[PDB]
Amino acid sequence: SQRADGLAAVLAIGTANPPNCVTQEEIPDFYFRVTNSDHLTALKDKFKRICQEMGVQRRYLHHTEEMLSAHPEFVDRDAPSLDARLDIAADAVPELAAEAAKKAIAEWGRPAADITHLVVTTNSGAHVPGVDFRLVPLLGLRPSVRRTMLHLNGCFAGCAALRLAKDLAENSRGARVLVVAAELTLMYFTGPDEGCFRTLLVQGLFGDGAAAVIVGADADDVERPLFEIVSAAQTIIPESDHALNMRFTERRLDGVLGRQVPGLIGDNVERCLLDMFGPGGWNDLFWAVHPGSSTIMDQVDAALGLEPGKLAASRRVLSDYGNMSGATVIFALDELRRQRKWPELGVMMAFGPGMTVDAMLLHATS
Amino acid sequence: RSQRADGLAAVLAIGTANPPNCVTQEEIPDFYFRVTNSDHLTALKDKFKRICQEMGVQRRYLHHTEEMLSAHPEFVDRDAPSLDARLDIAADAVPELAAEAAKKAIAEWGRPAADITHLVVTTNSGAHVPGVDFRLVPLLGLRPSVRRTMLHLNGCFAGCAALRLAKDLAENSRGARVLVVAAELTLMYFTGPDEGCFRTLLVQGLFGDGAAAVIVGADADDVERPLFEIVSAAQTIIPESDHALNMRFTERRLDGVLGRQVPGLIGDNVERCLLDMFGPLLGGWNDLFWAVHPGSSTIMDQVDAALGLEPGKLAASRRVLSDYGNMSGATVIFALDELRRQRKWPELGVMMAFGPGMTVDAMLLHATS
């Protein structure tokens, strides 16, 4: 065979979201209505204070009032419903992912058929053939496109997905990689419980979306390289696997959102980056970071002493779409170039269970 | 751009492992209807008895024991939620079994777990974050900055898919050493017998547990012994066949479908597949060596007839189906390991596996000295 010569670069970015948009102001009433609990005035009150301090202005949801009425089991906090959840996802994800993918392909400039590798990641699924497969007919990808399917990788999925693309693009001349991350929060949706804070954090922080990226090295003259992926690394924060967990259950996609999370990223981020990239302050770089929440973003700002405008793009995404798991960071990178229209080097990173920090040192181009 | 490897990624070591509880095919019929309280269904047991006798498997290894089944009455109740208990058991057993296999592989390789740069793990028996890959970190003494890839639920073609990924990880970075691990615990499918559908009996007389690990890396040290260089890794789909085979998690267990059309769809299309996949790079298939996922004996026949292979070509593969049964994504790796032992001539060979899609994931290999 033959290989590529230069660095894998991001050639295009495409995103998409469910049509149903719920503002943050209206999330409490909506939520407490479809979950039949408007009587729990106090809990609904703790949920109002919470929401106002999350950093989100609005979210997009595939699930609606009609869909939830069609499935009272999603609300019955203690009833099996994964099947119903997976059947809706089995169709909705490929749909949403294709849309975001077409958008990326449109900016890129070449036909879906020119894609040689497909890397898909999402927590909203569990099928074989998976989304990666169903995207072939939906996009018009060649049958021999080389696929990787990543089911359930959590909040650091996008970055993790982009790490494999780099090597996929760099080790084969002409190789072109479509990376797709998509998330559907109906996987976690359930009624509230007087003592379960995680259900409210989720309900007021997560949102639906899919993000797409075309990666390739030795870009044509027709292609417009936006970012070069200099290095792609990952590391773990010591003894913190009990702060973030996710797992499929009979009832839904469950887990744990420890209060220590923000403090852990805050105390370890700088160290994590230096171990990952070691080889002139952090403000000399540009940033595209998975916005866990505003607190999390405040922890990163503090630890790195970044000027407000550095994570502006990232907070903007959290604010306009909410937390969309792995796709969030790619939305972030997108928002970063929209407004760019100065530093040449930057960091694209995301945290998730582990705790795991996945990142890439990027190089901006014309 | 940083330094890349010079030559092709190569298999420097292979290690396998299986749960301690071995069950022979002759024992399967009694074991199964007993623990499923269906021992009164004398007619159905006879059906499952002859089906079992022509699968091409003489014995298997199962993590689930009768004591474990008695402790989980919910497992044999086809109409009862239990994915929770199945996953809980797997969250502990898979990484423990996967460690055993990776350790044997690291032992063969000769180098320290600390020299491992990337970790790629695949398995249908898991659904957690941190997943099996993270857990192998403390269990194997791997460096924290090791670059992980967790592939949840990829089916019977996972072994090859995982290895296809490793080729690029290893080749793109000078000094890269990839640890690939595939593991399968069939308790994820375990349930009682059924009149309406015999997918259960099929799975019950064919699948077994196992885990396999491989160290992949290019530019071998003088202390390393490259076994097979991964020349090319590709993947393709067979038309209008996604209906004959599929899997998905359900509240009751890991379910799916096994169609009768599966074996015929492979015999009718393998050659087209290999051609489209490796076309240019490659007077008959009987000149290559073969490591093939062994769905069943019938599937082995189909490949033999379609490619025109003599009985010896797929012996290593049939040998694995016989000694272990179908262990999903890990099977094709046991086969390569078996081939390696049944060779202690063709320099080029094909490592191939099939799965839902239908998908054909294979690599063109080069046997070294």
Tokens of B158: 């996972």
Tokens of B322: 């016989």
Nearest to B235 by CA among B120, B357, B317, B139: B357
Contacts of B169 in chain A (CB under 8 A): 164, 167
Residue in A146, A276, A354 nearest the CB of B145: A276
Q: What is the CATH number of the domain that holds B195?
A: 3.40.47.10
A305 interfaces chain B, CB cutoff of 8 Å: no
Scanning B133-152 for CB atoms below 8 A from A yields: 134, 137, 144-152
User: According to DSSP H, which parts of B220-260 are helical?
Assistant: none
Residues A235 and A320 in one domain: yes
Cβ(A214)–Cβ(A162) below 8 Å: no
Distance between CA atoms of B127 and B311, rounded to whole angstroms?
Answer: 39
Q: Which of A225, A246, A266 is the last residue of a domain?
A: A225
In Å, how far is A29's CA from the nearest CA of chain B? 31
Largest CA distance in chain A: 67
Tokens of A122: 């999402």
User: According to DSSP H, which parts of chain B are helical?
Assistant: 28-35, 42-52, 66-70, 83-109, 132-140, 158-172, 199-204, 261-278, 297-307, 315-324, 331-341
Given resolution (angstroms): 2.5
Q: In sequence order, which residues have a C-beta less than 8 Å from that of residue B168 and are 6 or more positions away?
A: A164, A167, A168, A170, A171, A172, B9
Q: Which residues of B are catalytic?
A: 156
A17 interfaces chain B, CB cutoff of 8 Å: no
Residue in B152, B231, B234 nearest the CB of A146: B234
Q: How many inter-chain contacts (A to B, CB under 8 Å) are there?
A: 174
Residue of chain B whose alpha carbon sits nearest to that of A363:
B1
Residues A52 and A190 in one domain: yes
Nearest to B83 by CA among A77, A189, A196, A83: A83
| Torsion angle defined by CA atoms of residues A249, B118, A358 and A337, in that order, rounded to the nearest 10 degrees | -120
Q: How many other C-beta atoms can be found within 10 angstroms of the C-beta atom of residue A1?
A: 10
B39 interfaces chain A, CB cutoff of 8 Å: no
Which helix (H) or strand (E) covers residue A268, if one does? helix A261-277
Please tell me what DSSP assigns to residue B216: E
Residues A60 and A85 in one domain: yes
Q: In sequence order, which residues have a C-beta less than 8 Å from that of residue B170 and are 6 or more positions away?
A: B5, B9, B10, B118, B176, B177, B178, B216, B217, B218
Distance between CA atoms of B366 and B369, rounded to whole angstroms?
Answer: 10
Q: Which of A194, A225, A256 is the last residue of a domain?
A: A225
The technique by which this structure was obtained is X-ray
Nearest to B216 by CA among B142, B310, B120: B120
Q: How many other C-beta atoms can be found within 10 angstroms of the C-beta atom of residue A79?
A: 15
Q: What region, left, alpha or beta, does residue A154 occupy, with left being phi > 0 and alpha being psi -120 to 50 degrees?
A: left
Dump the DSSP string for B132-201: HHHHHHHHHT--TT-EEEEEE--GGGHHHHHHHHHHHHHHHSTT-EEEEEEEE-GGGT-----SS--HHH
Residues B201 and B339 in one domain: no
In Å, how far is B26's CA from the nearest CA of chain A? 31
* Radius of gyration in angstroms for the set of CA atoms belonging to chain B, rounded to a whole number: 20
Contacts of A244 in chain B (CB under 8 A): 129
Q: Is A98 helix (H, G, I), strand (E, B) or coil?
A: helix
Breaks following residues of chain A (C-to-N distance > 2.5 Å): 279, 341
Distance between CA atoms of B135 and B131, rounded to whole angstroms?
Answer: 7
- Helices A27-34 and A41-52 cross at an angle (nearest 10°) of 140
Residues B140 and B254 in one domain: no
Please tell me what DSSP assigns to residue A244: E
Distance between CA atoms of B291 and B230, rounded to whole angstroms?
Answer: 13
Tokens of B254: 């890991």
Scanning B159-188 for CB atoms below 8 A from A yields: 161, 164-165, 167-169, 171-173
Residues B242 and B302 in one domain: yes
Nearest to B309 by CA among B344, B360, B356, B274: B274
Residues B198 and B243 in one domain: no
Distance between CA atoms of A22 and A334, rounded to whole angstroms?
Answer: 22
Residues A119 and A148 in one domain: yes
Nearest to B360 by CA among B288, B271, B286, B284: B271
- Helices B315-324 and B297-307 cross at an angle (nearest 10°) of 170
Contacts of A275 in chain B (CB under 8 A): 144-145
Largest CA distance in chain B: 68
Distance between CA atoms of B226 and B340, rounded to whole angstroms?
Answer: 12
Distance between CA atoms of A108 and A102, rounded to whole angstroms?
Answer: 10
Give the CB-side neighbour count of residue B281, counting CA atoms within 13 A. 18
Residues A220 and A231 in one domain: no
Cβ(A34)–Cβ(A65) below 8 Å: yes
Residue of chain A whose alpha carbon sits nearest to that of B121:
A150
Tokens of A181: 């991350």
| Torsion angle defined by CA atoms of residues B114, B117, B123 and B126, in that order, rounded to the nearest 10 degrees | 70
Q: Which of B226, B247, B276 is the last residue of a domain?
A: B226
Nearest to A354 by CA among B151, B133, B94: B133
Please tell me what DSSP assigns to residue A344: S
In Å, how far is A194's CA from the nearest CA of chain B? 24
Boundaries of domain holding A283: 226-366
B51 interfaces chain A, CB cutoff of 8 Å: no
CB-based burial of residue A229 (10 Å sphere; 0-12 exposed, 13-18 middle, 19+ buried)? buried
Distance between CA atoms of A161 and A150, rounded to whole angstroms?
Answer: 8
In angstroms, how far is CA B58 from the centroid of its own chain? 18
Q: In sequence order, which residues have a C-beta less than 8 Å from that of residue B23 and are 6 or more positions away?
A: B31, B59, B60, B61, B62
Distance between CA atoms of A179 and A229, rounded to whole angstroms?
Answer: 14
In this structure, what are the phi and psi dihedrals at residue A232, rounded to the nearest 5 degrees?
A: -135, 115
Domain count, chain B: 2
Residues A87 and A62 in one domain: yes
Contacts of A245 in chain B (CB under 8 A): 128-130
Residues A210 and A255 in one domain: no
Residues A238 and A281 in one domain: yes
Q: In sequence order, which residues have a C-beta less than 8 Å from that of residue A193 and are 6 or more positions away?
A: A77, A199
